[PDB]
C-alpha cells in the first residue's frame, strides 16, 4: 500500500565525474543508498529506481532491494517518474517521489509526510520547508484552508510571492492511481521541452482534488547535492547529526569536528572516541571502549573494554578487554578473543586468537589458530602462501613461539611448546616439546683486530 | 588562611555514565583535576572535596592532594558544603566554593576573587559574569554601593530583573567562620527539599554583613559541563586557549583546530606542530623541534632540534637533533641520546640509545643499552622475555649488528663488533670480533627446470 | 619592461623567532616563495629581494630566481626600496613593490594591477581594498576623476576620512624611472626617523603626475602576517582557496577543513581525498585515485587508479592501479610499476618494483630492482649497507622470495626462482632455481614433560 520512486538518472554535470551523481558517497555510502534506507525505513514496501544509460553500477550497488526502470531521454521529472509505470501503474496506495541526491532525508520526515497525506485523504502532498534566502525556489502559496493553492516558480512570480519563505522541496506523496493518470496529461510546452512533475499538482487542483502541504522544520534535510562542495557540506551535516546523537547517548567524542561515524554504527555508553577516528559500515562498539586517535574501523565488532589505538580494522571481531595497536592491522576474518594483545606493527588476517593470546610486535598471523594464553614472539610469521595455495597453521595453548620464527604451513604446534628464536619450523611439534632449527654461534675474536 | 571546598558528588545524569561526572576528562585529565590545579594555583592551602557513594575512583585519582568529606544524601549545595565541617568548621580565613565540573576556571580569576574578597573585608563574595542570553540564571541585583542586593532566580523574578545580563556563577568566596555559622541556619522549605548555598548570602545580608560581587570578563571560564556535548565544548575552549598561548609565545601550529596540547605541556620557541598532533601529560618540548602530523606524545621530554614523525611516544626522553619515525613507538623508559635515528616500524622500550646510535627499521629494542654510533640492522630483536622474566642486552659502541639478528638476553656485544645478518646470538661477543650463526647457502640450479 | 621589489628584511618581532619573518611557511613553503611565484606568474622578468643582516637562509632558499640588495639599517620602506637602485635605477618600465609577508597575494591581482597602471600611463598605482573595520589603515581619498587624492593615515585623519572603508594595501606599481627619482626626495622628518614609501605618491601628485587606484575585491589576499596566529589564519585561508578549487574541478574531499593540499599539487578528476591527508611540494595525482586518511605525500607522482592508505610518500612514483599501505613508507627514489602491491609496515627506498610485483608486509627494499610479478615474502630484507657503502640487489621476474630472507647485496636472483623461508642469501642464484640457507628442524618431544 506504499511505494517509492527514486530519481537516479541525473547526469550531475557540475560533479565533473564519469560516475552517476547519486553514487558519490557521504559517510561511507552512496547518496542513493542513504535515500533508499530512509525510504524503506519509512514503511515503503516496493521501491522503483529510475536509471539512465550505463547504470550497471547503480543496479549493481543497490541490488535486489529495488526495481529498476530505464529513462532513455532526459525529458523532465514527470517523464522520469512515468518510466516506473511498468511496475506501478496498476497499484493502489501511496507513492512518494524522492531524488537520490538528497542524502540527509530522514525516515521520520518521510513517515510523517505519508501519515499527513493518508490522514487527509489527499491526492497529493508536497514536502515543504522554510528558508532564510528563498531566491530561486518554487514558493508555496497556501489557500484559505491551509492547503496548496499553487507552487510559483521564481521566473513567474510577483513581487509579493517572492517574499514567501516556504518553498517546495521537490519531494511529493501521491495517490498512486491519480499520479499515473495525471502523468499522461502533462505537456512539455516550455523552452526546455521537458515534462515537469509539479504540473501533476496543478492538474489535481484543477480537478477539485485535495493537495496538502507538509512542512519539515529541518531545511537541512532536503539538501540537494549538485557539486562536490555541496557533497562536502552533506558530509559535515551528517557528521554533526550522528556525533550529537552519540554524545547525548553517553559516548565521549573528544573532537566531533574531526570524528567520522557512519549512520549504521552503534556505540555503547562510556566509550571514548579520540580525534580523527573513522568508523563506518555496520559496526558495533560495546561499552567502556577506547578508540584511539586516527584509527579506521569498518564493518567490525568491538566488545566492551577493548582499546584500539591508531590502527586499521576491517571485517574483524575484537573480544572484551583486548588491546590492539598502535599501528596494527586487522584484516577480514581476524577474530580476537578476550584479553588478547595485538601490538605495534602486527597484521592479523583470517585468524582466530583465543583468550589471553599475545602477539606483541612485528608479526604476521594469517590463516591460523592461536590457542589460549600462547605467546607469539617478535618478528614471527605464519608462512601461509606458497605461490599457489594458502595453508593453515595451528598453535596450541600455553605455548611460547620465539622471536623471528617461521611457521611453514600446513603445520601444527602443540600445547605447552617452546619454539626457539630464529627457527624455521617445517614439521609438526607435539605437546610439551622444545623445537629448534638454527645454527649455533661462531665467535671470531679479534677477526676485526 | 585560605581553604577550598570542591563539590564532586554530582550524579551527572545527562552524562549517561557509570562514572562520576567530574572524572570525565578534558585535555587529557579529569575535570576535577583542572579545578584542583586552579584552586591550588590560586594560593589555597587546604582543599576539601565533597564525594558521594562509591567515590574510590575520585579519591584514588586525586590522592593525598585533597581531604575528603562524604555526602550520603543529595540535599543541595548548602548541605554538600556543610559536610566539610569536620575539616574546616573551626578554621579562620577565606574559603572558596567551586564545582568540580567547571574545568575552564582559571587561577587568575580565583586569585582576584580572593583578593577582592579580602581587600573588602567582606563576609562573602559572588563571582559573577555577563552573558548575552541570561535566561535561567540567577541575576545579580546590585545596591547603591555596588555591593550585592540579592540574587534573583528566574522563577521568582520581575520582568525588569529578567533583563539583567550579570548572573551568578555559583562560585563564592566566604569568611570561613561566617560560612559554617550560617550553614546551620539554612532551611529546605522548598519543593526540592534541598538546602541551597546562595541562601547563606541572604543570611549575611539580613545581618548587615558585607557581600561583594566580582565580575569576570571571561564568561567561558565559568562553564558548567552537564552532558557530553558540553564536554566537547570544553575541549574546544581549552584547545583554543592553549593553542593561542603557544602561537603568541613563538610556536608555529599549522592547524590549531586539529592540534591538541594539554595544559601541562611546555613548548620552546621556533617549534613547529603539524596537524593532528596530540601532546598531553607533563611534556617538555625544546626549541626548533618539529612534531610531525598525527603524532601522540604523553609525559615525555623532547630536546632541541628533534623531529618526531607520526609516532607514539610515552614516558620517554629524546635527545637533541634526534629523529623518530614515521610510524615508530617509544614506550615508557625509552631514552634516546643526541643525533640518534629511530626509523619506521621500530619499537623502543626501557632502553638507552647512546649518541649517534641508529635503529632504522623494523626492530624491537627492549631492556637494553645501545652504545654510541652503533648501527642496528633491519629486522633485529633484543630477545628480552623468556615467559618468566625479562633480561638485559648490552651492545657496545661503534658496532654493527646485521639484519634479522636475534640477541638472546642476557648477552653482551662488545665495541667495534660485527654480527652477521641472520644470526641468533646466545653467547657474549668480545670487542673487535665477528660473530655469525647461520647456515651457508645451497643453490639447486634447474631444480625448477 | 616589468620588475619587482620584494621587501624581506622585516625582523617580525611578534613572531618570537630566530629566523627571518618571510621564511616561515604556509602550505609547505616560505611566505616569500609564495610572493615570488605570484610576482613571476604576473609577468615580471627581474626580481630584487631586499634582505637584512644574516640573510643567507633567504638567499639560500630563493637561490638564483632573485637578485638581492642589502638593507643595513631599518630606516623605512622607502629606504628599503631604494637599496634596489644598484640593480634597477637605470631600468625602464613598470616596477611593483610587494612585501614578502603577504603569502595569499594572487598573480591575477598583480596582473590586473600592472595592466591598470600601464593602460592608464600612470606614474604610480595603489592596490586598494575595502574592509569592514578600517581602523588603523591608511584611507584612500579619491579625487573627482576617480584617481588618488591622498592616503590619509588614521593618526592624521578627520572624522569623515575615518569612515572610509577603502584602504591602502601597501602594494604599489610604479613607473620605474619616476620611482627612483622620487626616492631621493623622501625625507624622514618624523618621530620614527624613517623614510616612508607612500611619500613617493604625494611627490608625484605635487608634480601633476597620474596616480591611479586599483581595488581588489578580495581583501583576504592582501593579508600581512605579523605573528603566528596570523600565520595560522593564512594557512586556513590557503586551505579553503585550494580545496574549493579542487572540489569544483572534480575532486572529492571528504573533510576539507582537515585536508591540506599545497598550491603546486595537481589532482585529476574522480579522485577521493580522505580526511587528514597532507599533500605538498610538486605532486601530480591522476584520475580515480584514493588517498586514504592521514597520509602524507610530498613531491611525488601517483598514477590513475592508485590507492594510498595512511602512508608516507616522498619523492616517489606510483604506477597505475597500485596499492600502498596502510602504514607503508616510500622514500626518495621509490619507483612502483603498475598493479604493484606494497603492504603494511613496508619501506621502499631507491628501488624499482616492476609491474605486478608484491611486497605485502614487514619488509625493507633498498637500492634494488624487483622484476615483474615477483613475490617478496613477509619479513624479507635487501641488506644494502655494510657500514661503508651501499650495494645493489637484483631480483628477476616471476620469482618467489620466501619469508624472513636476507638478500646480502651485491647479489642477483634470477627469474622463476624460489628462495626458501629463513635464508640468508650471499651468492647469486640462476634462473629456475631453488635456494635455501637454513638449519633443519630438531624436535625434542617431552623435553618440557
Ligand atoms: C622480544 C620478544 O618478543 S621476547 C619473547 C620471545 N622469546 C624468545 O624468543 C625466547 C627464545 N629463547 C631461546 O631461543 C633460547 O635460546 C632457549 C630458550 C632455546 C635457551 O635454551 P636453554 O634451555 O636456555 O639452553 P640450552 O642450550 O641448554 O638448550 C636446551 C636444549 O636445546 C639444545 N640446543 C640449543 N641450541 C640448539 C641448536 N641451535 N640446535 C639444536 N639444539 C640446540 C641444547 O643442546 C639442549 O638440548 P639437550 O638438553 O638435548 O642437550
Ligand atoms: C637494510 C639494513 O639494515 S643494511 C645494515 C645491515 N647490514 C648488514 O646486515 C650487513 C651484514 N653482512 C653480512 O652478514 C655479510 O654476509 C658479511 C659481513 C658476514 C660478509 O663477510 P665477508 O667478510 O664479506 O665474507 P666471508 O665469507 O669471508 O666471511 C668472513 C669470515 O666469516 C666466515 N663465515 C662466513 N659465513 C659463515 C657462516 N655461515 N658460518 C660461519 N662462518 C662463516 C668465513 O669463513 C670467514 O671466516 P674465516 O676468515 O675464518 O675463513
Ligand atoms: C606470509 C607470507 O609472506 S607467505 C609468502 C612467502 N612464502 C614462503 O616463504 C614459502 C616458503 N616455503 C618454504 O620455505 C618451504 O619450506 C619449501 C618451499 C622450501 C618446501 O620445499 P618442499 O619442496 O615442499 O620440500 P623438500 O623438503 O622436498 O625441499 C625440496 C628440496 O630442498 C631440500 N631442502 C629442504 N630443506 C633444506 C635445508 N634446510 N637445507 C638444504 N636443503 C634443504 C630438500 O632436501 C630437497 O632437495 P633434494 O630434492 O635435492 O633432496
Numbering used by the authors:
A (entry chain A), B (entry chain A), C (entry chain A): 2 to 450
Show the paper's wording:
This occurs in a two‐step process, with the acetyltransferase activity of GlmU first catalyzing the reaction of acetyl coenzyme A (AcCoA) and GlcN 1‐P to form CoA and N‐acetylglucosamine 1‐phosphate (GlcNAc 1‐P). Subsequently, the uridyltransferase activity of GlmU catalyzes the Mg2+‐dependent reaction of UTP with GlcNAc 1‐P to form UDP‐GlcNAc and pyrophosphate. We identified that Staphylococcus aureus GlmU (SaGlmU), which was previously targeted for inhibitor development, possesses a dual‐cysteine variation (C379/C404) within the acetyltransferase active site.
Both structures were obtained under reducing conditions in the presence of 0.5 mM DTT. The biological trimer assembly is captured in both structures and the oligomerization interface is largely comprised of the LβH of the acetyltransferase domain. Finally, the interface between the AcCoA and GlcN 1‐P sites of SaGlmU, where C379 and C404 are located, was compared to the corresponding region of SpGlmU. For the cocrystal structure of SaGlmU complexed with AcCoA and citrate, which was crystallized in the presence of DTT, this region closely resembled that of SpGlmU complexed with AcCoA. However, this does not introduce any notable structural differences compared to SpGlmU, with the sidechains of key catalytic residues E348 and H362 occupying the same positions in both enzymes (Sulzenbacher et al., 2001). Therefore, C404 is likely to share a similar role to S404 in the acetyltransferase reaction, which was proposed to facilitate recognition of AcCoA and/or stabilization of the resulting tetrahedral reaction intermediate (Sulzenbacher et al., 2001). Therefore, we propose that the acetyltransferase activity of SaGlmU is repressed under non‐reducing conditions due to disulfide formation between C379 and C404, which simultaneously clashes with AcCoA and prevents C404 from hydrogen bonding to the thioester carbonyl of AcCoA and the subsequent tetrahedral reaction intermediate.
